[PDB]
């Protein structure tokens, strides 16, 4: 009868106030978890902020070494210009040497011919002087030998 | 009809209770959404970190490659500098060979000129001598033979 109807509402009202205790326990554990998670996510957010700046710093250091590389290259470039100009100057000097040598030779040849002509002129003139000297004296001797023939 | 009011309490409570059992079933589904979205953000945040750490690490590797390019290419500058010195030496030798040839050419051409002058003096001295004597001998000879003939 009703004794079986209240013995039911008994077991039911029990499990209800029972599972209400379990829900309250459920909810105090989820309060505790979401609070520890809010304090953890705060940490991961900060390690990330740090990572980011870290990576951005690594970038700057890379770029900075590139800038140094591109300056080196700019200098190695001036060395190649310089080497090029020394080589060109060398080439020019060499052909100048060649040319001057060839001129030396030629002028040296012309000096020789000149000296040959000079020598011949001097010898020819010398022969003349030697000849005239003896012959003129030979005239003066022949006249002397007549004068002195009758000197008493 | 007094206990009928007690069944108005119970009825009314089994509705306020059946109602907060539905506000819960909804609350819990709204929370299992948040938590699912947090899991999302969390996998995303973890992804960025991974990419960050990887991009950062590839940059470190590239940095060391870059440094190696600097060292390698800086050897080719030690050689460039040794060359510039050698070509600078080859150039001073040549500038001297030129200085010396230019000198020799000036002298050898001086010698030529002088030999040409001496030759012109020499020919002039001789031909003046020959001309003068020729004239003086003519008169002396004629007048002697004016007499050698007036003998007969």
Author numbering:
A (entry chain A): 542 to 693
B (entry chain B): 541 to 692
What did the authors write?
Among the downstream targets of activated Rho are two isoforms of Rho-associated kinase (ROCK), ROCK I/ROKβ/p160ROCK and ROCK II/ROKα/Rho kinase, which share 65% sequence identity and 95% sequence similarity at the amino acid level. ROCK is able to regulate the phosphorylation of myosin light chain (MLC) by direct phosphorylation and by inactivation of myosin phosphatase through the phosphorylation of its myosin-binding subunit (MBS). Human ROCK I consists of an N-terminal serine/threonine kinase domain (residues 73–356), a central predicted coiled-coil (residues 422–1102), and a C-terminal pleckstrin homology (PH) domain (residues 1118–1317). Interaction between GTP-Rho and the RBD disrupts ROCK I's autoinhibition and thus activates the kinase.
